[PDB]
């Protein structure tokens, strides 16, 4: 993950953030983008969480570090649009 050269060479996602802990930034360095910085790094150890689409009734998903947000449309709500 870290070394004298692991973080001195070119930043590639096919290198640093994959086979250790991927603590931080090494998922942001590759892209230079703090938008999905903490909406994807939660999916390094335990697997994805929105791939099941818990929200039904045409509701979008949002991943948080422990709980899932389900955006349901006007007049629709719920923990999973439930």
């Amino acid at each position: 993950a870290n070394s004298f050269l692991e973080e001195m060479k070119k930043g590639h996602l096919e290198r640093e953030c994959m086979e250790e802990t991927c603590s931080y930034e090494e998922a942001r360095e590759v892209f230079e983008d703090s938008d999905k910085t903490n909406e994807f790094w939660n999916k390094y150890k335990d697997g994805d969480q929105c791939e099941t689409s818990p929200c039904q009734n045409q509701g979008k998903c949002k991943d948080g570090l422990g709980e899932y947000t389900c955006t349901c449309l006007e007049g629709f709500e719920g923990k999973n649009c439930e």
Partner: protein
């Protein structure tokens, strides 16, 4: 003789190395090369 310098009256002749005026470019001794190494002596270990 002239080579010795005398400090009574700043007695010293103008000099120049001969190699400067005419070089004798033998080349070098480029045999078994040299290297630099990490300060700890091990580049990067890999937890096992």
């Amino acid at each position: 003789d002239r080579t010795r310098y005398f400090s009574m009256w700043n007695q010293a002749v103008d000099s120049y190395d001969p190699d400067v005026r005419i070089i004798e470019n033998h080349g070098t001794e480029d045999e078994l090369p040299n290297y630099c190494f990490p300060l700890g002596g091990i580049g990067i270990t890999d937890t096992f």
